[PDB]
Amino acid sequence: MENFQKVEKIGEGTYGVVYKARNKLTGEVVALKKIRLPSTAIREISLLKELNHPNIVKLLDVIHTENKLYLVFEFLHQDLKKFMDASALTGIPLPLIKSYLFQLLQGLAFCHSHRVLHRDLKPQNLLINTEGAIKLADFGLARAFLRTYTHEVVTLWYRAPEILLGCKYYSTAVDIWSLGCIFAEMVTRRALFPGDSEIDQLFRIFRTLGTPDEVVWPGVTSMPDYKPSFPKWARQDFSKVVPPLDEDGRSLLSQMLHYDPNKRISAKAALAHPFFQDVTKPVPHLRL
Numbered sequence: 614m615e616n617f618q619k620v621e622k623i624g625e626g627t628y629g630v631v632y633k634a635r636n637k638l639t640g641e642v643v644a645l646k647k648i649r650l651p652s653t654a655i656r657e658i659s660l661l662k663e664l665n666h667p668n669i670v671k672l673l674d675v676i677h678t679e680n681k682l683y684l685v686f687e688f689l690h691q692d693l694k695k696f697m698d699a700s701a702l703t704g705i706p707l708p709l710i711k712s713y714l715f716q717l718l719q720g721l722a723f724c725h726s727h728r729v730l731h732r733d734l735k736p737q738n739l740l741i742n743t744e745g746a747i748k749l750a751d752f753g754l755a756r757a758f759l760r761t762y763t764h765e766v767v768t769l770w771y772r773a774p775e776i777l778l779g780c781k782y783y784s785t786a787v788d789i790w791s792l793g794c795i796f797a798e799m800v801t802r803r804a805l806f807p808g809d810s811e812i813d814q815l816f817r818i819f820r821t822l823g824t825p826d827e828v829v830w831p832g833v834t835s836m837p838d839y840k841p842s843f844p845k846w847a848r849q850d851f852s853k854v855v856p857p858l859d860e861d862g863r864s865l866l867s868q869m870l871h872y873d874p875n876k877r878i879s880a881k882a883a884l885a886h887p888f889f890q891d892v893t894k895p896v897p898h899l900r901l
């Protein structure tokens with residue numbers, strides 16, 4: 614590459630291949646994201662160069678050369694998916710789960726206050742470092758690029774039910790839902806809703822939380838992909854779904870997983886929940 618050296622392919626991302634690269638002029642190691650291919654997206658993503666926070670992966674540069682587009686981000690050594698897999702025998706310790714959730718809510722509260730959504734949070738785009746930080750990767754990109762950039766199998770596991778029901782608009786609440794699913798997975802060491810198709814995803818949610826109705830979600834029955842023929846499942850207690858999470862954690866999770874997006878706790882209000890009374894910032898055991 615003219616301006617970098619490739620150290621390795623990191624892998625396939627949501628928008629194209631991702632490389633670990635060294636800037637030829639500065640020697641720094643960065644994440645270089647090639648966007649698999651548009652004038653609208655460059656200005657809008659370039660505005661994300663201004664969306665800086667300790668819990669957001671820094672966008673260093675937007676490079677449009679040779680009719681190719683490449684995003685340059687600050688490099689982090691591990692993602693939460695790999696850390697949860699590495700931690701599977703013991704689980705991630707609860708103080709670290711709480712630290713991670715708290716920091717991720719800080720990042721969402723910051724982005725949401727600046728009117729930027731993620732829309733596609735998942736453990737693979739939550740990046741961690743040795744100092745106990747976690748950062749959200751790729752905030753703002755879905756709006757800017759949305760939507761065909763890969764043929765790789767898209768994960769539906771963290772998708773909010775309004776989007777599975779075909780609402781074509783998004784709100785801050787989609788990110789709270791995804792983060793609630795990720796919270797539950799850290800605690801139980803299993804994905805909460807591991808669907809392998811949109812209807813399997815939606816029916817896994819309904820089997821746990823109950824089939825939604827107009828009482829708990831006014832407007833649900835008029836949403837584009839809602840069918841009156843959906844089976845009617847009863848809702849399970851969170852005490853069964855995420856043991857051994859304590860009643861503070863279960864209360865918070867329930868507020869992150871309300872069906873009606875409008876009823877879902879905000880990131881800012883979640884930071885004030887009693888669950889975070891005893892929050893600390895532990896050192897993670899990272900094997901790199």
Ligand SMILES: O=C(O)Cc1ccc(OC2=CC=NC(=O)C2)cc1
Pocket residue numbers: 623624625626627628631643644687688689690691692737738740750
């Ligand atoms: O986009 C996705 O679906 C998954 C994905 C997320 C982020 C990726 O990039 C990095 C991974 C690790 N460290 C970094 O610094 C960058 C690559 C893939």
